[PDB]
Amino acid sequence: HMASPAAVNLGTAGNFVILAKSGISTTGTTHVTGDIGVSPITATGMTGFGLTMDSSNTFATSALVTGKAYAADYTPPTPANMSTAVSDMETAYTAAAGVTAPAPVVELGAGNIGGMTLAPGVYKWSTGVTIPTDVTLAGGANDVWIFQIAQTLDLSNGIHVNLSGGAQAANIFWQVAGQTTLGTTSVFNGNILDQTAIVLNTGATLNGRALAQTAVTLDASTVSAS
Long-range contacts: 123-129, Cβ < 8 Å, 24+? Answer: 123/147, 123/148, 124/148, 125/149, 125/150, 125/151, 126/150, 126/151, 127/151, 128/152, 128/153, 128/154, 128/178, 129/153, 129/154
Residue at 146 is within a domain: yes
CB 183 within 8 A of CB 159: yes
Looking at residue 132, its amino acid is P
CB 107 within 8 A of CB 100: no
Give the three-class secondary structure for 93.
helix
Q: Which helix (H) or strand (E) holds 69?
A: strand 69-71
CB 68 within 8 A of CB 52: no
Q: Give the Å distances, CA to CA, from 55 to 51, 52, 58, 61.
A: 13, 9, 8, 11
Residue at 81 is within a domain: yes
What whole-number distance in Å separates Cα of residue 123 and Cα of residue 106? 6
Task: Give the experimental resolution in Å.
Answer: 1.5
Which residues on neighbouring strands pair with residue 147, listed in sequence order?
123, 174
CB 22 within 8 A of CB 42: no
Q: What are phi and psi of 37, to 5 degrees?
A: -165, 155
Residue at 153 is within a domain: yes
Looking at residue 135, its amino acid is V
Residue at 42 is within a domain: yes
Please count the structural domains in the chain: 1
Residue at 5 is within a domain: no
CB 18 within 8 A of CB 33: no
Verify cis geometry, omega within 30 degrees of 0, for the bond prior to 132.
no
Looking at residue 140, its amino acid is G
Please list, in sequence order, all residues whose beta carbon lies within 8 angstroms of the beta carbon of residue 75, skipping any fewer than 6 positions away.
56, 57, 58
Residue 100 is part of which domain span?
Answer: 11-224
Residue at 50 is within a domain: yes
What whole-number distance in Å separates Cα of residue 9 and Cα of residue 35? 18
Burial 68-88 (b: 16+ CB within 10 A, else e): bbbbbbbeeebbebbebbbeb
Residue at 1 is within a domain: no
Biggest alpha carbon–alpha carbon distance for the chain? 53
